[PDB]
Amino acid sequence: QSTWRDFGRKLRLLSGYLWPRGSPALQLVVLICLGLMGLERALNVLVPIFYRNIVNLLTEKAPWNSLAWTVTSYVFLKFLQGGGTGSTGFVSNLRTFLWIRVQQFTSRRVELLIFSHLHELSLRWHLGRRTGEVLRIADRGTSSVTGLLSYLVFNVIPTLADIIIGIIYFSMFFNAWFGLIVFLCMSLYLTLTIVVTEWRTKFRRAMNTQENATRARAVDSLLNFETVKYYNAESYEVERYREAIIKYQGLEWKSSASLVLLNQTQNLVIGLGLLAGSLLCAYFVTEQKLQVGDYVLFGTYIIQLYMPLNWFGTYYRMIQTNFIDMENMFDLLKEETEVKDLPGAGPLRFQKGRIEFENVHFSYADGRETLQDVSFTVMPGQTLALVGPSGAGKSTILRLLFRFYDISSGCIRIDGQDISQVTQASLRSHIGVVPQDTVLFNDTIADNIRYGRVTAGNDEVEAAAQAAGIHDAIMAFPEGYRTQVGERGLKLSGGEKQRVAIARTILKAPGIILLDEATSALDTSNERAIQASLAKVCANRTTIVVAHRLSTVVNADQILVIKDGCIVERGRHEALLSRGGVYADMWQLQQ
Amino acid sequence: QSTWRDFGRKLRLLSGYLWPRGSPALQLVVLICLGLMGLERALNVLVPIFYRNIVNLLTEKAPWNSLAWTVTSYVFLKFLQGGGTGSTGFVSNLRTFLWIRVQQFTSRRVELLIFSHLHELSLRWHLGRRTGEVLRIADRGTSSVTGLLSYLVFNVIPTLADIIIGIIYFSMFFNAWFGLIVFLCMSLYLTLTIVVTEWRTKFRRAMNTQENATRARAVDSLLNFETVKYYNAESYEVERYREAIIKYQGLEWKSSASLVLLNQTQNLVIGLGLLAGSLLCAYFVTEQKLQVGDYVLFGTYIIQLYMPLNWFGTYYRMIQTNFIDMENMFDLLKEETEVKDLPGAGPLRFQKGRIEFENVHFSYADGRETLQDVSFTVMPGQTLALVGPSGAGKSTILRLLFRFYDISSGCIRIDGQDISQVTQASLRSHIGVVPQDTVLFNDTIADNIRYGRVTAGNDEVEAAAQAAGIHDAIMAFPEGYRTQVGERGLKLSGGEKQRVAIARTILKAPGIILLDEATSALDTSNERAIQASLAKVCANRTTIVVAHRLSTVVNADQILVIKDGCIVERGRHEALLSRGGVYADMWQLQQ
Numbered sequence A, B: 001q002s003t004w005r006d007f008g009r010k011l012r013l014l015s016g017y018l019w020p021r022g023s024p025a026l027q028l029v030v031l032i033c034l035g036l037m038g039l040e041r042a043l044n045v046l047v048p049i050f051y052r053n054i055v056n057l058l059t060e061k062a063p064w065n066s067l068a069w070t071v072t073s074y075v076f077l078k079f080l081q082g083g084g085t086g087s088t089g090f091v092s093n094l095r096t097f098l099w100i101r102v103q104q105f106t107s108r109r110v111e112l113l114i115f116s117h118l119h120e121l122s123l124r125w126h127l128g129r130r131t132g133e134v135l136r137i138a139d140r141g142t143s144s145v146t147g148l149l150s151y152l153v154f155n156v157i158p159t160l161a162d163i164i165i166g167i168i169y170f171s172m173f174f175n176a177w178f179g180l181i182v183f184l185c186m187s188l189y190l191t192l193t194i195v196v197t198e199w200r201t202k203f204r205r206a207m208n209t210q211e212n213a214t215r216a217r218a219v220d221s222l223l224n225f226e227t228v229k230y231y232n233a234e235s236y237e238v239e240r241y242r243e244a245i246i247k248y249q250g251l252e253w254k255s256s257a258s259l260v261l262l263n264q265t266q267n268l269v270i271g272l273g274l275l276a277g278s279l280l281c282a283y284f285v286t287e288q289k290l291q292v293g294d295y296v297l298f299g300t301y302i303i304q305l306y307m308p309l310n311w312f313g314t315y316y317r318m319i320q321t322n323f324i325d326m327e328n329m330f331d332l333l334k335e336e337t338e339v340k341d342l343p344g345a346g347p348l349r350f351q352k353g354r355i356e357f358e359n360v361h362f363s364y365a366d367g368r369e370t371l372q373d374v375s376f377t378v379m380p381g382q383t384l385a386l387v388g389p390s391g392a393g394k395s396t397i398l399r400l401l402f403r404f405y406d407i408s409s410g411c412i413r414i415d416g417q418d419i420s421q422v423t424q425a426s427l428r429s430h431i432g433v434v435p436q437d438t439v440l441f442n443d444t445i446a447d448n449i450r451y452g453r454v455t456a457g458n459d460e461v462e463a464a465a466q467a468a469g470i471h472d473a474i475m476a477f478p479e480g481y482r483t484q485v486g487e488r489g490l491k492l493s494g495g496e497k498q499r500v501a502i503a504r505t506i507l508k509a510p511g512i513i514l515l516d517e518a519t520s521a522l523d524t525s526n527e528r529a530i531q532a533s534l535a536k537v538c539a540n541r542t543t544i545v546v547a548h549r550l551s552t553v554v555n556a557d558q559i560l561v562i563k564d565g566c567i568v569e570r571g572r573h574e575a576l577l578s579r580g581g582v583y584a585d586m587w588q589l590q591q
């Protein structure tokens, strides 16, 4: 009693996992599946008993008909039970085929749960962890839980149960010494298998690691084809690749040899047990203590026990690795940040459109605070701009306005309504934003510009395309609206991406339009046509913008200049030139 | 005789493949391995004969000692042959362990051959094919050839051979009707397996394709986390993912059910054959025509035949897919471009350093020729520049100078030496070039700036680092020279990349230094320090450059302006301003 209470709640949670909590018929499928597994374990003893009975009736003179009937019964059981390999039988195969429905339900439920829980985390969690490996953890976790349940319920517990049935049949119906032989032989076999597998796993993991390094050495060398052509180094690249190959062979040989040693040890143990049992059984049956078929029964029973026990090592490794992998996935599932939550849940009301700041500090980086009590306010229809010395402070201002991160000390309200207790669905309904640079994922134009809401209609979406004028390029595409777009599809322009963005935010029709402008190269005339479209979508809508151009500065109804989280200049475009602060110096460098 | 002559030369080439053409002992290993395979096929008949002999001596009254000796011999053969037919016995396992050396030689040779042949192709071939899939073809080809040889030599030919031995043993030593039963049963079994597998492969491939699509729908949705957070579409993303899951289940169920049907058909056929054989054998042995152990012999022989024949379907699929995959790899191996080759092989001599052009046209794009008879010449030490209206013509001029592509009509010589018959090793020895933007692959600084030649020494490479002044940033790294660098390693600056480039070309010490400048953002003072380093490495060296800045234009000793492959302006910086062509207009827009 050392490792008992730790595994209990985890095994209880997995016990909750396999049983469908609400499904009507799936639980019946589970019960009938376990019933078939039990009946197959019955067949594993009831076949060779009939074999002994056949050879007993044959070895003495018997009538033809009764012997024929029992032979038919024997070959019938050799059909219902598997011919060999604990599979290939009308009972185990029907168990597998009838089992395949519940695995679908289990996999779908667990994997959709983990997918929703990845989309519920906050932004700050994702920027820390490498996104290229969380995916692997989740996928391997789902495959791990289905594999672990399948293996450890249907191919390890039945085998050990069959060992126990075996020791009992021999002890109760044969001499005790036969039970001693089978017991000692199978216990020794299991102990040798366990020890050698836990020794061999080191070579296994070292081989895998070196394999992933050698393959990478090559993909990169071919991809940098241009550089290796430059520097006249083909022979050097080939030689270094050969060295990586040689090291990989030097590990793989060790792994394969260890496998052979394990296999030969197992075979020797079963052969030794078979020799002892066959000799002793022969001695009794030639001393008239037993019957002729008992030797045949013992031979076929040892072979029948050995055939599924041969695959014990790989089950042991796979249960170990999926167990630790489920532990990692379960750890990630319990991990949770969700900074934006309040149980009061008072959704936002839109009545004016006033954006007011009140003395808020902020530190997404630890220690270095990037906000010193900035405070301003706007009226409905007001257009604000934010330009100053280079820094991510304005971008963080937008992101904290969007309830990505949290205020540190202070509060920001919209229309005098505190944003702390508002549901985020209500907030992201009221707000809308064209970003830095949009990313358009692999789909057609039609649904991707329908993406602004679920209920987007066809007439509405062609109406919005006419509103923001993509239709010329859309007809310039081969099939038009059904054009496949993305990394799989066609490459587009950054101006086209901003056109997509203004289309989908038109479809959203937000209260306040936020903008975040990039340094994408475009001619000024088309840039200002896009600016006119943004001006008309923000017409009678309050607007906060970051800008980099002179017109995009001078359009401001309330400019603001900040650096390192503090307000330094304010007013308008003409007033700050007459003031001649850093605005006047920056304006000459924008020429 | 329809598909005989087509397979002959391919099978002859694979016959050349397995046999090592020069190795002394590997051929001996191959012969001893085939000898062990033959002896194992002998054991597969010699075991159950002894089983029948044991039960025959047991069923009559026999002395203890002789029976004990033959029982020991039987269990001994059950050790040498697999306890369970398959790879579980000393005769076969030693074959696998002793075989593992020749597979290393085969895999290393074929995969290094294909790697060298990918590095021998020209540049124009790579820009056409997607590089993201040639890699898959090569890797799967090498794994295909080793798998195909292993499967089709060691687990299909032996099984069919064992079937033939079986029909003969029964026909020659038993009644002819037993041979008829085993023949008809195994022929029917093979035909059913073949037909059902070739029917099932459709569901297999459809399941794989839908699987790769569903997974991709998810990785992209998580990666665009920011956009899906913007547009308030978590529930929509989850729902669309659930639809993809449901379609995937709707295919996977069909595949699994087809597998179950195949397995049950196989088991039913073997069970039916076993029933017919056991009944008829029982009738003869109760009519005194045979001996008691003949029933036992037939039962164990049918089980021994069935146990390896159960795995026929997956061998059939895997031989089919690796066969077509080896065909693809072999097609790619025979594919070859190698535009730069002449058997005369007259290497370049460097005596002056004069670069002369003589009336050459060029068309890397078909039809649209991008070179109209450009011709000029330089003296040793001359510095040339190439700036004009935007176009890839200058870049192609450098690339054709480097013997990437070919001249179309005309010739270009260096120092009056024709570059057509020069060996490319001689050319790339004499020439050196700093490129557009270098790529530095995953290694340390030390060998990556040693990369300019194989014989790079430690004192030389620290000397070159002192020469080009990276040493301050190198000590600014954590451990200094052993810093791991790349995508795995640290990110660096573009100026640092150009420093690496000037270091490795210093180490090369070429005749003519070519440069190709990018639009990387850098301050002018450090840019001109880098320019001074390039000026001193090209000091007393002829130089051809593309430029974008005023100083990088006015340094030219012989300027040249081209557009769409034709020469339009020439002279120097001052002369073309006085001429006032497109040079004067472009110079005002460079301000």
Ligand code: HEM
Binding pocket: A085, A311, B086, B087, B155, B311
């Ligand atoms: C889903 C679980 C399984 C996996 C992942 C698996 C994996 C593999 C793989 C990758 C091979 C190719 C040969 C190799 O890699 O050396 C293979 C072959 C084989 N598997 Fe499985 N297998 C599984 C289930 C089973 C079961 C249940 C059995 C029967 C007890 C079995 C018996 C075999 C046999 C006899 C071979 C051929 C060995 C040879 O040709 O040398 N496998 N398996």
Ligand SMILES: CC(C)CCC[C@@H](C)[C@H]1CC[C@H]2[C@@H]3CC=C4C[C@@H](OC(=O)CCC(=O)O)CC[C@]4(C)[C@H]3CC[C@]12C
Binding pocket: A038, A041, A042, A045, A046, A161, A165
């Ligand atoms: C979930 C798993 C662990 C269930 C395992 C079930 C076994 C522990 C038991 C339950 C029913 C038992 C069977 C019940 C009846 C029979 C028939 C019996 O055949 C006879 O000839 C007995 C009657 C007689 O004396 O005539 C031989 C044992 C056997 C197969 C028993 C073998 C052991 C079995 C399979």
Ligand SMILES: CC(C)CCC[C@@H](C)[C@H]1CC[C@H]2[C@@H]3CC=C4C[C@@H](OC(=O)CCC(=O)O)CC[C@]4(C)[C@H]3CC[C@]12C
Binding pocket: A065, A068, A069, A072
């Ligand atoms: C459903 C498909 C797969 C066909 C399955 C057929 C079997 C169920 C048949 C075929 C051969 C039959 C056997 C053929 C001959 C005999 C001898 C026969 O002997 C007598 O009738 C004794 C003399 C008498 O009383 O007339 C008893 C039935 C038996 C064992 C038969 C039992 C039923 C068997 C196994």
Ligand SMILES: CC(C)CCC[C@@H](C)[C@H]1CC[C@H]2[C@@H]3CC=C4C[C@@H](OC(=O)CCC(=O)O)CC[C@]4(C)[C@H]3CC[C@]12C
Binding pocket: A177, A180, A181, A184, A185, A272, A273, A276, A280, A287
């Ligand atoms: C390494 C693994 C395979 C275990 C091997 C153990 C055997 C070497 C041992 C354990 C059980 C022993 C047997 C247990 C009981 C008996 C019965 C015993 O019988 C009598 O004493 C009288 C018999 C009679 O009068 O008929 C003779 C020794 C013998 C065969 C023993 C011989 C040696 C055996 C087979």
Ligand SMILES: CC(C)CCC[C@@H](C)[C@H]1CC[C@H]2[C@@H]3CC=C4C[C@@H](OC(=O)CCC(=O)O)CC[C@]4(C)[C@H]3CC[C@]12C
Binding pocket: B037, B038, B041, B042, B043, B045, B046, B161, B165
């Ligand atoms: C697949 C390729 C490599 C061909 C493989 C051929 C073997 C499968 C054959 C060839 C010769 C055969 C043997 C020829 C003669 C005998 C003796 C035969 O009887 C005896 O052992 C003694 C008989 C007597 O007393 O005369 C048992 C089968 C055996 C070993 C045969 C087993 C199968 C063998 C090895």
Ligand SMILES: CC(C)CCC[C@@H](C)[C@H]1CC[C@H]2[C@@H]3CC=C4C[C@@H](OC(=O)CCC(=O)O)CC[C@]4(C)[C@H]3CC[C@]12C
Binding pocket: B065, B068, B069, B072
């Ligand atoms: C190498 C390691 C794995 C040990 C292997 C041991 C076997 C080779 C031994 C152990 C038991 C032995 C058997 C034990 C008893 C007998 C009875 C013995 O009967 C006699 O006739 C002997 C006495 C006499 O001469 O009258 C003949 C040898 C035999 C079969 C022995 C043959 C050799 C065996 C199988």
Ligand SMILES: CC(C)CCC[C@@H](C)[C@H]1CC[C@H]2[C@@H]3CC=C4C[C@@H](OC(=O)CCC(=O)O)CC[C@]4(C)[C@H]3CC[C@]12C
Binding pocket: B177, B180, B181, B184, B185, B272, B273, B276, B280, B287
């Ligand atoms: C579906 C697959 C598994 C094929 C099944 C074929 C059987 C239904 C056939 C083929 C071989 C036939 C046997 C071939 C030869 C004989 C011996 C023949 O013997 C005699 O004529 C006299 C025997 C004597 O006097 O001892 C009786 C019929 C029988 C058993 C035949 C019965 C029907 C068999 C088993």
Ligand SMILES: N[C@@H](CCC(=O)N[C@@H](CS)C(=O)NCC(=O)O)C(=O)O
Binding pocket: A111, A115, A132, A133, A135, A136, A138, A139, A142, B215, B218, B219
């Ligand atoms: N949460 C996703 C994860 C999907 C996933 O991880 N897919 C694999 C390919 S089958 C992958 O891209 N692995 C990440 C890697 O190892 O690069 C899911 O389970 O659907």
Ligand SMILES: N[C@@H](CCC(=O)N[C@@H](CS)C(=O)NCC(=O)O)C(=O)O
Binding pocket: A259, A262, A263, A266, A310, A311, A312, A313, A314
């Ligand atoms: N009999 C051995 C091996 C049985 C076997 O055939 N397993 C195969 C897999 S199908 C194996 O070990 N291959 C290497 C691996 O799985 O890593 C054991 O005790 O596990």
Ligand SMILES: N[C@@H](CCC(=O)N[C@@H](CS)C(=O)NCC(=O)O)C(=O)O
Binding pocket: A215, A218, A219, B111, B115, B132, B133, B135, B136, B137, B138, B139, B142
């Ligand atoms: N020629 C290389 C090719 C290596 C290769 O193709 N590796 C695989 C991974 S095992 C890869 O790059 N896959 C790319 C992909 O799947 O897109 C070799 O055989 O060593």
Ligand SMILES: N[C@@H](CCC(=O)N[C@@H](CS)C(=O)NCC(=O)O)C(=O)O
Binding pocket: B259, B262, B263, B266, B310, B311, B312, B313, B314
């Ligand atoms: N008995 C079946 C299957 C035998 C078997 O165990 N094969 C496994 C692979 S280890 C299988 O079919 N798995 C599914 C697959 O390979 O697609 C046959 O006729 O091939």
